[PDB]
Amino acid sequence: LRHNLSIDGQPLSLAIYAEPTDPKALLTSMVQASQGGSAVLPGTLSLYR
Amino acid sequence: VLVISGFAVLGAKNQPAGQHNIDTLFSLYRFHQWINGLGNPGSDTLDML
Numbered sequence: 001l002r003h004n005l006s007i008d009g010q011p012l013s014l015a016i017y018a019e020p021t022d023p024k025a026l027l028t029s030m031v032q033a034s035q036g037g038s039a040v041l042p043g044t045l046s047l048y049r
Numbered sequence: 050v051l052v053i054s055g056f057a058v059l060g061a062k063n064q065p066a067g068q069h070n071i072d073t074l075f076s077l078y079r080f081h082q083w084i085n086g087l088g089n090p091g092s093d094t095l096d097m098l
Contacts, residue, residue: 026086027086027088028085029087029088030089030092031084031091031092031095032092033050
């Protein structure tokens with residue numbers, strides 16, 4: 001009587017389902033980087049044409 | 050980016066740069082997860098990082 005059950009202890013009020021929050025999806029993206037050139041070496045002038 | 054910053058923008062515990070151990074390993078793992086979750090603006094995010 002105190003816990004509001006039946007004669008055999010079965011609950012008189014149906015327990016709520018408590019539907020979960022459920023998982024979510026994941027995402028990824030691209031990443032870039034930048035660089036410069038190398039020092040220009042003075043070409044040793046040959047004799048050819 | 051990490052090597053250019055020299056672990057200064059990564060941080061370290063009781064050591065300069067970073068020693069090859071579990072603390073830096075976990076830090077790098079969490080950092081990579083954060084980079085993956087960054088999203089499309091992650092490129093610019095790392096750019097000003």
